[PDB]
Design a protein around this ligand. Structure first.
Ligand code: GVE
Ligand code: MG
Ligand code: MG
Lengths: 232, 75
């Protein structure tokens, strides 16, 4: 396992009043940037700092919609509360989220409703056309995960024992990825995750409705795992 | 009538409910007892996620049935 670090973490006072709480938007911005640029350019300190800057902006946008809609008054976010069009210097993406994935360390089949264990989930993801982009939350901490052919990348916008700063953990296997999702310690028994796959498209401009975008992405991928029930 | 609600991490909640109660109402009862906001609750019975505007009776959920509670995590 190798590590590539930003120059700060998400709790830095520069990021605003919501410094700390923008983790999920920082993860979306990470995935967005890798989809557009490829992975290699994003894996340096300058680019990771740019991800954090853009993530703070996205979070601010998400925060206003939550307040306007009265989506909740909780400070932390669900995936469906993040704007599906994301615009940065790298370009513009639209995304659609998968159906929910939830589980513990081990797969549980709830009368036909499969709740995959974390390894089985990453393995499921790896059976799709690579790379696959994932938002994964464990506890209150959201990470971005990219399952690619030769490595699994885990972006963590918060401090770990291995890094003071936000970092991408470059993992040779899922055992290392799961360690990163586990805060590099042993928590087999307490483990529980909430994850969505993120299906991206490059957009020429931002002038597309959320409903138009979802239908377009459904037609692009033709993958039953895309959550259509999001439609409004 | 009594139903059981079990989470993925083992915990079992006992609830007193009526067949004509909506899924939304069941979620409200789970918040009243366990403090979990309804928007973070996914209730599962017979292999399927249950829809808020439907009732227990719509899903043929009867006395002593066990539902599963899958939780969304705010990040
Ligand atoms: N889920 C919000 C981002 C994580 C966080 O606030 O860490 C405390
Ligand atoms: Mg770069
Ligand atoms: Mg009555």
């Amino acid at each position: 396992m190798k590590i590539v670090r930003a120059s700060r973490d998400q709790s830095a006072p520069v990021y605003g009043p919501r410094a700390g709480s923008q983790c999920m938007s920082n993860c979306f911005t990470f995935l967005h940037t890798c989809y557009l640029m490829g992975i290699d350019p994003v894996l340096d300190t300058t680019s990771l700092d740019a991800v954090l800057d853009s993530g703070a902006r996205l979070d601010a946008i998400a925060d206003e919609k939550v307040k306007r809609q009265a989506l909740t008054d909780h400070p932390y976010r669900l995936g469906t509360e993040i704007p599906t069009v994301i615009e940065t210097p790298a370009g513009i993406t639209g995304h659609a989220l998968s159906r929910p994935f939830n589980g513990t360390a081990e797969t549980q089949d709830l009368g036909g409703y499969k709740c995959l264990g974390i390894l089985d989930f990453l393995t499921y993801a790896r059976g799709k056309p690579l790379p696959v982009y994932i938002i994964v939350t464990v506890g209150v901490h959201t990470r971005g995960v990219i399952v690619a052919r030769g490595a699994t990348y885990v972006f963590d916008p918060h401090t770990t024992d291995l890094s003071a700063e936000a970092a991408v953990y470059v993992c040779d296997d899922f055992t290392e990825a799961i360690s990163a999702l586990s805060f590099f310690t042993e928590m087999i028994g307490d483990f529980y995750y909430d994850a969505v796959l993120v299906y991206f498209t490059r957009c020429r401009t931002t002038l597309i409705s959320p409903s138009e975008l979802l239908v377009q992405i459904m037609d692009q991928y033709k993958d039953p795992d895309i959550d259509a029930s999001v439609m409004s | 009538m009594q139903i059981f609600v079990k989470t993925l991490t083992g915990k079992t909640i006992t609830l007193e409910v009526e067949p004509s109660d909506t899924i939304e109402n069941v979620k409200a009862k789970i918040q009243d007892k366990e403090g979990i906001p309804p928007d973070q609750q996914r209730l599962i019975f017979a292999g399927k996620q249950l829809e808020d505007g439907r009732t227990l009776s719509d899903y043929n959920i009867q006395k002593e049935s066990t539902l599963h509670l899958v939780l969304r995590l705010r990040g």
